[PDB]
Design a protein around this ligand. Structure first.
Ligand SMILES: CCCCCCCC/C=C\CCCCCCCC(=O)O[C@@H](COC(=O)CCCCCCCCCCCCCCC)COP(=O)([O-])OCC[N+](C)(C)C
Ligand SMILES: CCCCCCCC/C=C\CCCCCCCC(=O)O[C@@H](COC(=O)CCCCCCCCCCCCCCC)COP(=O)([O-])OCC[N+](C)(C)C
Ligand SMILES: CCCCCCCC/C=C\CCCCCCCC(=O)O[C@@H](COC(=O)CCCCCCCCCCCCCCC)COP(=O)([O-])OCC[N+](C)(C)C
Ligand SMILES: CCCCCCCC/C=C\CCCCCCCC(=O)OC[C@H](O)CO
Ligand SMILES: CCCCCCCCCCCCCCCC(=O)O
Lengths: 176, 79, 22, 176
């Protein structure tokens, strides 16, 4: 099933990267009641907050991420969205390795490295989610951008597993 | 607001208890290794496996291996 | 009690070892 | 690694002994508010308590350990500091055995003895610390003397492990 395995890997890598990039771009992480500048229903993301109703509806303002070392570091890390961006980077590199595999069948470690990138992307994603949620804590709901990030994590981990299976089976078959 | 604090899960026990747990962990692992080895009748409880046994005992996760001697069982029982 | 038991364990190990030696 | 094992053992024996002896000697176990004669910041060891700011800065006085049979025994044990001293004694004997092992290559048990001494030193050290902490609290901070004791414990246990490995390897090589 190597053809199907590679198909799953490529489709999944693209899906994870697309979902994660959209999530980092779009502004439907959180539904709360803040202000785009009275408090009304809004819809914030990682960078901008926007009004969901009333006169200033459609108006968005840059999130004042800033207004205790730990509080400072959390605020810093959440302000820059280090971890969502790092997960996007690693998904990109994983996709590059998956693409490069076919054009260079000589070296095995390419697809292995793809797998490892994907796994690491998932871990960065988790850290991101935790930092985001924790920084918010310092009524509400989560939007579809948040869930895009979550589904990116799941798919990334699946693709990592499949990639490592491909590498394992190549070394198992060729060695014996 | 009293912000919880990143390592606030340690709060139920004093810092001294945590540090002594770590020391006790090392001492238990080393004694289990020692009483299991220098007995020349037998010589699976090397140092690395001793550390793993002790860690799993503390986390109440059980074990791949249990001590079979009286000395190893005393150590295991008090831990 | 913990450190007591470790001491006791070492003692029993010595005794058993000497017994099995002779 | 035989030469390297013995080098580690000897260096470690000396390091553990030196750290523990310094710790028992020096007077920076505890930072707390008291009087070496209003009470100023001070630093205490096992024996002397000394003010580090004020008119009497640099003055020292013998701790009054004795200002409930269990309380009496704790006070006794912490006054004599039998356990830190016993730890130093056993480290000394372990070091002596390590030195002697280099001579009597016929009798293996010498190095095993070293091992056991070091392990035992570690145990007495831990009892020491518990007794010390238990007695004190019956704000504050711990100085570098306390941490010297702690590092002595760790090194002692490592050296004990290495010594027992040396003996095991002797009795294994002999069987082959
Ligand atoms: C054997 C395996 C061992 C595995 C060991 C695990 C390795 C250590 C990782 C933990 C470090 C996290 C950290 O310092 O958190 C910082 C935030 O920073 C974050 O938001 C951290 C995100 C990245 C985690 C990696 C804050 O931490 P802090 O500055 O220390 O302040 C906390 C203290 N306080 C509660 C008093 C406020
Ligand atoms: C702490 C948590 C995790 C750290 C544990 C990682 C090390 C595991 C032991 C390594 C070891 O066996 O090395 C050698 C000695 O090793 C030593 O002398 C070091 C052990 C020191 C004792 C620990 C006290 C301080 C820990 C702070 C011996 O090699 P071996 O005789 O082959 O031992 C079995 C190893 N095997 C199962 C891989 C075959
Ligand atoms: C299976 C193998 C495991 C076996 C293991 C048994 C091991 C023996 C347990 C140690 C008993 C310690 C002891 O009696 O504590 C004394 C103080 O103690 C101190 O001040 C600490 C002195 C160092 C003790 C180190 C023991 C080795 C006080 O104890 P007590 O006089 O009994 O006091 C009455 C009760 N009360 C404390 C609630 C008031
Ligand atoms: C085959 C089995 C081998 C057995 C291996 C032996 C280890 C036993 C383990 C734990 C119990 C020890 C803890 C109980 C300690 C008793 C002391 C105690 O409780 O003292 C209270 C004091 O009397 C105040 O009134
Ligand atoms: C048997 C090993 C179990 C693992 C135990 C975890 C050790 C936690 C860290 C110990 C150092 C001190 C932490 C407390 C610091 C504080 O909150 O003041």
């Amino acid at each position: 099933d190597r053809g199907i395995q590679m198909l799953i890997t490529t489709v999944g890598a693209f899906a994870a990267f697309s979902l994660m990039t959209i999530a980092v771009g779009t502004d439907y992480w959180l539904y709360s009641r803040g202000v785009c500048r009275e408090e009304v229903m809004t819809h914030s993301g990682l960078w901008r907050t926007c009004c969901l109703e009333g006169a200033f509806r459609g108006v968005c303002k840059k999130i004042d991420h800033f207004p205790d070392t730990a509080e400072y570091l959390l605020r810093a890390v959440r302000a820059s969205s280090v971890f969502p961006i790092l997960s996007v980077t690693l998904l990109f590199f994983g996709g590059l390795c998956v693409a490069a595999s076919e054009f260079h069948r000589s070296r095995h470690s390419v697809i292995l490295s793809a797998g490892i990138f994907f796994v690491s992307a998932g871990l960065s994603n988790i850290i991101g989610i935790i930092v985001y949620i924790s920084a918010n804590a310092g009524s509400y709901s989560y939007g579809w951008s948040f869930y895009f990030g979550a589904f990116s994590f799941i798919i990334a981990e699946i693709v990592g597993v499949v990639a490592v299976h491909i590498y394992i089976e190549k070394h198992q078959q060729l060695r014996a | 607001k009293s912000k919880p604090g990143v390592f606030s899960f340690l709060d139920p026990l004093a810092y001294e208890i945590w540090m002594c747990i770590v020391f006790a962990y090392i001492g238990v692992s080393v004694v289990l290794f020692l009483v299991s080895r220098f007995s020349p009748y037998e010589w699976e409880f090397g140092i690395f496996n001793s550390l793993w046994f002790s860690l799993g005992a503390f986390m109440q996760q059980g074990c791949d291996i249990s001590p079979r001697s009286l000395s190893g069982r005393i150590v295991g029982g008090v831990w | 009690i913990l450190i007591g038991g470790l001491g006791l364990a070492m003692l029993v190990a010595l005794i058993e070892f000497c017994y099995k030696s002779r």
